[PDB]
Amino acid sequence: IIIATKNGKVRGMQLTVFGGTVTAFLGIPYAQPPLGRLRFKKPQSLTKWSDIWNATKYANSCCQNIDQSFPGFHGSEMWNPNTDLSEDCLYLNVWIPAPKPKNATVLIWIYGGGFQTGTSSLHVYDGKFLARVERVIVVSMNYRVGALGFLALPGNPEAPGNMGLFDQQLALQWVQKNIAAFGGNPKSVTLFGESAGAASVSLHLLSPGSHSLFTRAILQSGSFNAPWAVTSLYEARNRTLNLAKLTGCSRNETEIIKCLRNKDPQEILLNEAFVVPYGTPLSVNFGPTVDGDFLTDMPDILLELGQFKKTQILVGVNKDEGTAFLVYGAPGFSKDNNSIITRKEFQEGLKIFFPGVSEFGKESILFHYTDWVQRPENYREALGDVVGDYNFICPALEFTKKFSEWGNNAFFYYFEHRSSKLPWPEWMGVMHGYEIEFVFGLPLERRDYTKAEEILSRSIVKRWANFAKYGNPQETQNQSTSWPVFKSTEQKYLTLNTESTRIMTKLRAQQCRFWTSFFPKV
Ligand SMILES: *[C@@H]1O[C@H](CO[C@@H]2O[C@@H](C)[C@@H](O)[C@@H](O)[C@@H]2O)[C@@H](O[C@@H]2O[C@H](CO)[C@@H](O)[C@H](O)[C@H]2NC(C)=O)[C@H](O)[C@H]1NC(C)=O
Ligand SMILES: *[C@@H]1O[C@H](CO[C@@H]2O[C@@H](C)[C@@H](O)[C@@H](O)[C@@H]2O)[C@@H](O[C@@H]2O[C@H](CO)[C@@H](O)[C@H](O)[C@H]2NC(C)=O)[C@H](O)[C@H]1NC(C)=O
Ligand SMILES: *[C@@H]1O[C@H](CO)[C@@H](O)[C@H](O)[C@H]1NC(C)=O
Ligand SMILES: *[C@@H]1O[C@H](CO)[C@@H](O)[C@H](O)[C@H]1NC(C)=O
Ligand SMILES: [Cl-]
């Protein structure tokens, strides 16, 4: 099975999926390896090749630090790179239905990982199920992360910033120019990602350069207005310099880059952590910045004034977004016990999560979240909601409200099902990132999940697919709850779970008024 692309021929492999077949093209190059003098620069167009490129295995993941907090634990290790790390990592994957489709909708996945980690080869991002079940074409790409992908020196082409975002864009471009050859429809491309990947999707909605590279967007647990999604020019500058010093590269700013371009990836990765005086468990040392190229102004401004691609969006969050981060720094927390903490530990926890916040700012948080409705887990649960509400839920709801105010249909979901196979303890509930396997349809594979989860996954997959193809996330055949549009006034949203799916209104009303209106002032 050979497909001819604009840059050359590529060979794929046949896969057996649910008594059927899916054709996968794993590891297709989409840009010149960003090596040597190209390190830190925007992705360069790839050179036309001769012969057949064998896209039969996942390519190298981009250089990144790994989570070493729980060696041997699947809960954390499932997110670590499952492919060799390398600077030569600009590759993408394509899963197409078999027999070859004629004009299928294309789903392009953008993985999360705080812009510091991640890779498209993870088991939970396997797109062969979606290709099989919904007959859509699934594409995913590897983009540079950490300093290698976001080191910023605004205005300087040697390290302009947002390189990772531009890698993604170049991948979207590749789909535009090549997907037709795989039987895909370049006019029907839906982007979807989670966390930092969702924030990336939201930024593409704002970048004029990406406007004509996709049709619709899906944002799972993330958006650019999340406090961890955009690095300020001030912080970027101070971090670029701190990195320079830690590697003995302090100098002319262009000479600094030349210096850093002689350093080994390991030395650069090793010092990324200390660039920030007091970082938090979210740890976005090097992220998106207003570069004047990909992002022409502060995103908050563009959003507020309706400057973005006009189209439909599907947005959502998980019930317990914050828990996952409590075991990476919060005192009294552990994945090995019920983590019943005290008021004192809670207060210390806020310290960990809001390092540069005034003493009054932290008290305002405690005041809002401690008016107990006694229960030994009051503080444990409060800190999780605090982290979740502040970092994900409220920013996602605000993004949705603002985006829809400009006339486009928007759909919001509240994911509240805890995977029966979740390796983490129960007190962590419906964790951040664990709706992904349902979106990708892993529960459809009976070899593994309860019957209820197969049904829930099958439904979500259909809704996501209908949204991509028709801009409407409905499940029209099995007498399913209709998903109402999200509007600024009523603010209806759909709950996803195995029990009963409901239509609710104004998610976290009181909590978000706190984070969206008050807190930004402290
Ligand atoms: C901007 O960076 C400075 C410098 O950070 C220090 O040097 C870096 C190379 C790295 O090694 C960091 O871990 C160091 O902290 C920050 O200033 C530091 O502030 C802390 C406050 O706790 C102080 O203990 C350090 O001595 C200061 N560093 C020195 C020696 O000047 C500064 O806070 C950063 N600016 C921002 C964004 O707040
Ligand atoms: C839950 O565990 C935390 C973390 O303690 C570590 O992991 C435990 C499972 C066990 O292996 C301990 O020996 C480890 O130290 C406990 O928090 C610690 O509590 C002690 C005393 O309260 C304190 O001195 C430590 O600094 C704490 N560690 C941290 C990182 O905060 C916690 O007490 C346990 N919860 C329960 C079951 O009460
Ligand atoms: C690609 O696969 C073909 C046959 O499977 C093989 O002959 C060729 O050497 C491969 N190309 C490589 C390894 O670069
Ligand atoms: C795919 O559909 C588009 C409209 O969505 C149409 O313009 C295009 O010609 C189709 N591609 C094919 C099968 O030629
Ligand atoms: Cl239902």
Q: Which helix (H) or strand (E) holds 330?
A: none
Task: Supply the DSSP symbol for 266.
Answer: H
* E-only strand ranges, 305-399: 313-318
103, 106, 179, 214: residue to mutate for ligand 4 pocket, most atoms within 8 A of CB = 103
Position in ligand 1 atom list of the atom nearest CA 275: 10
Nearest-5° Cα angle at 168, 166 to 170: 70
Rounded CA separation 47/106 (Å): 25
Q: CA separation (Å) from 329 to 75, 146, 333, 336, 346?
A: 17, 20, 8, 15, 12
Domain 1-522 has CATH 3.50.50.60: no
| Three-class SS of 440-457 | CCHHHCCCCCCHHHHHHH
Position in ligand 4 atom list of the atom nearest CA 187: 5
Rounded CA separation 409/397 (Å): 14
Q: Which helix (H) or strand (E) holds 187?
A: strand 184-194
**Residue 87 designated active-site:** no
Position in ligand 1 atom list of the atom nearest CA 241: 9
User: Which burial class, exposed, middle or buried, applies to 458 when counting CB atoms under 10 A from its CB (0-12, 13-18, 19+)?
Assistant: middle
**Residue 432 designated active-site:** yes
Report cis status (omega within 30 of 0) of the bond before 99: yes
Distance in Å, CA 111 to ligand 4 centroid: 28
Q: CA separation (Å) from 254 to 124, 242, 266?
A: 40, 15, 21
**Residue 28: beta bridge partners?**
92
- Please tell me the residue having the least CA distance from ligand 4 atom 10: 103
Nearest to 4 by CA among 136, 182, 131: 182
Experimental resolution (Å): 2.4
**Residue 415: beta bridge partners?**
318, 496
Residue extents of the structural domains in the chain? 1-522
Instruction: Please report which ligand is nearest the Cα atom of 52.
Output: 3
187 lines ligand 4 (CB under 6 A): yes
Distance in Å, CA 492 to ligand 5 centroid: 16
> Could you please report the per-residue DSSP string of 1-42?
-EEEETTEEEE-EEEEETTEEEEEEEEEE-S----GGGTTSP
Distance in Å, CA 423 to ligand 1 centroid: 38
Q: CA separation (Å) from 325 to 76, 163, 296, 416, 428?
A: 11, 27, 32, 18, 10
Task: Identify the active-site residue in 61, 120, 195, 207.
Answer: 195
Rounded CA separation 104/489 (Å): 36
- Please tell me the residue having the least CA distance from ligand 4 atom 12: 103
231, 239, 242: residue to mutate for ligand 1 pocket, most atoms within 8 A of CB = 242
Rounded CA separation 100/102 (Å): 7
Q: Are 280 and 355 in contact (CB under 8 A)?
A: yes
Rounded CA separation 411/429 (Å): 24
Task: Supply the DSSP symbol for 44.
Answer: P
Give the end-to-end CA distance of the chain in Å, rounded to a whole number: 60
Q: Does residue 118 have a known ligand-binding role?
A: no
User: Tokens 């600094």 correspond to what residue?
Assistant: 256
Amino acid at 382: A
Q: How far out from the chain centre does Cα 476 lie?
A: 29
187, 189, 215, 216: residue to mutate for ligand 4 pocket, most atoms within 8 A of CB = 187
Q: Are 383 and 326 in contact (CB under 8 A)?
A: yes
User: Tokens 């619709």 correspond to what residue?
Assistant: 216
Distance in Å, CA 336 to ligand 2 centroid: 9
Distance in Å, CA 423 to ligand 2 centroid: 20
Task: Supply the DSSP symbol for 46.
Answer: P
User: Tokens 């001819």 correspond to what residue?
Assistant: 4
Q: Which helix (H) or strand (E) holds 493?
A: strand 492-496
User: Hey, what are 298's tokens?
Assistant: 């502060």
Task: Identify the active-site residue in 321, 398, 453, 475.
Answer: 321
Rounded CA separation 436/461 (Å): 11
Q: Does residue 432 have a known ligand-binding role?
A: yes
Q: Does residue 123 have a known ligand-binding role?
A: no
Mutual angle of helices 343-353 and 359-369, in 10-degree steps: 130
Determination technique used: X-ray
Q: Does residue 113 have a known ligand-binding role?
A: yes
Nearest to 398 by CA among 515, 238, 480: 515
User: Tokens 């419906």 correspond to what residue?
Assistant: 430
Compute the CA torsion angle 151, 80, 389, 205 (nearest 10 deg).
50
Instruction: Please report which ligand is nearest the Cα atom of 236.
Output: 1
Q: Are 469 and 456 in contact (CB under 8 A)?
A: no
Distance in Å, CA 232 to ligand 1 centroid: 16
Rounded CA separation 501/474 (Å): 13
**Residue 195 designated active-site:** yes
Q: Are 25 and 5 in contact (CB under 8 A)?
A: no
Q: How far out from the chain centre does Cα 166 lie?
A: 15
338 lines ligand 4 (CB under 6 A): no
User: Hey, what are 363's tokens?
Assistant: 């008290």
Q: Are 481 and 502 in contact (CB under 8 A)?
A: yes
User: Hey, what are 78's tokens?
Assistant: 């499932």
Rounded CA separation 244/187 (Å): 44
Amino acid at 260: L
309: how many CB neighbours lie within 10 A of its CB?
19
185 lines ligand 4 (CB under 6 A): yes
